[PDB]
RNA sequence: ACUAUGGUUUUUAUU
């Protein structure tokens, strides 16, 4: 059976399929370490995968487009947990235990009016 | 060179110092120590620790004269007036009595009143 | 208590928690018509003062 | 059991032999440019083993055993008074502070920057010599001249 | 009762 999960984060969108079978991982029809190797988020997608042990009995197939690498990796991590919680509903209790089934507390908000980036405090020295 | 066996310990606690002196069965001071002589300054000479090590250094100031029993005389209100006893209870000799007296008692002697005036 | 009480004493009398300023006091014998309670034993919550 | 512990946060490295790593490479790090602060792993100690003696298996372990903070002295409230007290250096800080405290000679020694600075300050720290050690025993005695209540 | 620690509030004007 083909267990499906979508995931999205900061202008990036991903789709994940999980199947029982041979322990392989494919992304955008490339190997997991074929074009990544220096990017600071390239390992965070492995966090939920050791919870059921890696690359011995489960087939992964990932597709992604849009945004940048830290967005794509966070979208893929939650797409993996949304597919993995269909494969076995008792993993829900274990994915909560590590924070991997929740949308993280960083998302894009609309531009606060004027004032450059509108987050910094302006000049208030007393001179 | 000889054992005195019996004597008296003289303690004082002030708001700016702590003093411990030990006397033989004839009233002769064999050794003395103060918290100011222990390197401390101001009201820090009245800390419970400075009072404990001043007593420990006074037990070290009588280590050879051979003591088995004594009584204690406690003077003054200073905060060192409890911790000074713990190093003397570890000096290796018995404490037969402790006479406790503070100067100029009046008006209830400043205990905590616990939600009273 | 540290420096606020020296004496020879590190012991304390345990009559002063949930007995004073309340129940009671600002609302003395206010409701339910009780006449036992810790509010009658509040005359034991003394000394404290004078040592 | 769901919400329990929660575990990890950081993981132990099989090759570095120290858990201080996640706070050791946080030193001289600006605008999030980590690789310009991580530039001392398998480089500076490879040079220390070519500037003072031989090997590097215990040099960073023993330097922070020789330079070890244990007490700190602050003005602290009892209400309304604010007595000076000695307090013990908190267990998660106790060996993680001194490695960030060697700065009052860094712009003066002329050691030719980063990994070559580290290859000289550790050979003083491994004898409790040189920078900031006179100030460490000055705090140790700032807590000896007054021990407060314990 | 103990952050050791800062002098004292100008002659005096009169929308």
Tokens of A56: 């011995």
Q: What is the DSSP letter of D2?
A: -
Count Cβ atoms below 10 Å from residue B83 Cβ, excluding itself: 20
- Cα separation, C47 vs C15, in Å, equals 10
Nearest to B115 among C4, C5, C20 (CB): C20
Question: Chain C partners of B109 at a C-beta cutoff of 8 Å?
Answer: 50-51
- Cα separation, C16 vs D46, in Å, equals 67
Q: Are B18 and B46 in contact (CB under 8 A)?
A: yes
In the structure, how far is the CA atom of residue B21 from the C1' atom of nucleotide E4, in angstroms?
31
List residues in chain D touching B: CB distance below 8 A.
145-150
- List the end-to-end C-alpha distance of chain C, in Å, as a whole number: 15
- Cα separation, D120 vs D111, in Å, equals 8
Cis peptide before D80 (omega within 30 of 0): yes
Question: Chain A partners of D11 at a C-beta cutoff of 8 Å?
Answer: none
H helices within chain A, ranges in order? 69-87, 92-95
For A127, the 3-state DSSP assignment is: coil
Give exposure, B19-41, as e/b (b: 16+ Cβ within 10 Å).
bbbbbbeeeeebbbbbbbebebe
Q: Are strands D84-88 and D71-75 parallel, antiparallel or unpaired?
A: antiparallel
Q: Are strands B18-24 and B29-34 parallel, antiparallel or unpaired?
A: antiparallel
Give exposure, C25-34, as e/b (b: 16+ Cβ within 10 Å).
eeeeeeeeee
Count Cβ atoms below 10 Å from residue D55 Cβ, excluding itself: 9
CA distance B41 to chain D (A): 8
- Cα separation, A50 vs C50, in Å, equals 69
For D142, the 3-state DSSP assignment is: helix
Nucleotide in closest CA–C1' contact with B110: E1
Q: How was this structure determined?
A: cryo-EM
Q: Are A57 and A94 in contact (CB under 8 A)?
A: no
- Cα separation, A96 vs A75, in Å, equals 17
What H or E segment, with its residue span, contains residue D61?
helix D59-66
Token look-up 């002329």 returns: D110
What resolution in angstrom units was achieved for this structure? 20.0
């Amino acid at each position: 059976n083909q267990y499906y999960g979508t995931g999205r984060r900061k202008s990036s969108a991903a789709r994940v399929f999980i199947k029982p079978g041979n322990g392989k991982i494919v992304i955008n029809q490339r190997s997991l370490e074929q074009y990544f190797g220096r990017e600071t988020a390239r390992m965070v997608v492995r966090q939920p995968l050791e919870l059921v042990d890696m690359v011995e009995k489960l087939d992964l197939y990932i597709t992604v487009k849009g945004g940048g690498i830290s967005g794509q990796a966070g979208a893929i991590r939650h797409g993996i947990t949304r597919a993995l919680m269909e494969y076995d509903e008792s993993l829900r209790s274990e994915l909560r235990k590590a924070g991997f089934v929740t949308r993280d507390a960083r998302q894009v908000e609309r531009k606060k009016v004027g004032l450059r980036k509108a987050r910094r405090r302006p000049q208030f020295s007393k001179r | 060179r000889k054992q005195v066996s019996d004597g008296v310990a003289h303690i004082h606690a002030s708001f700016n110092n702590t003093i411990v002196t030990i006397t033989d069965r004839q009233g002769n001071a064999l050794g003395w120590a103060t918290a100011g002589g222990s390197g401390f300054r101001g009201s820090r000479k009245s800390t419970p620790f400075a009072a404990q090590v001043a007593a420990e250094r006074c037990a070290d100031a009588v280590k050879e004269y051979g003591i088995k029993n004594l009584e204690v005389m406690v003077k003054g209100p200073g905060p060192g007036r409890e911790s000074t006893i713990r190093a003397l209870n570890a000096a290796g000799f018995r404490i037969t009595n402790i006479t406790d007296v503070t100067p100029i008692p009046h008006n209830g002697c400043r205990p905590p009143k616990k939600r009273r005036v | 208590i540290k420096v606020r009480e020296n004496e020879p004493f590190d012991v304390a009398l345990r009559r002063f928690k949930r007995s004073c300023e309340k129940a009671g006091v600002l609302a003395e014998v206010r409701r339910r018509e009780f006449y036992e309670k810790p509010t009658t034993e509040r005359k034991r919550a003394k000394a404290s003062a004078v040592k | 059991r769901r919400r329990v512990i929660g575990q990890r946060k950081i993981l132990p490295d099989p090759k570095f032999g120290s858990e201080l790593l996640a706070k050791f490479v946080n030193i001289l790090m600006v605008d999030g440019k980590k690789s310009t602060a991580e530039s001392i792993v398998y480089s500076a100690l490879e040079t220390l083993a070519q500037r003072s003696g031989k090997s590097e298996l215990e040099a960073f372990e023993v330097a922070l055993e020789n330079v070890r903070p244990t007490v700190e002295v602050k003005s602290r409230r009892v209400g309304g008074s604010t007595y000076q007290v000695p307090v013990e250096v908190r267990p998660v800080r106790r060996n993680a502070l001194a490695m960030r405290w060697i700065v009052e000679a860094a712009r003066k020694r002329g050691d030719k920057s980063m990994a070559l600075r580290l290859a000289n300050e550790l050979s003083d720290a491994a004898e409790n010599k040189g920078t900031a050690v006179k100030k460490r025993e000055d705090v140790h005695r700032m807590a000896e001249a007054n021990k407060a209540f314990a």
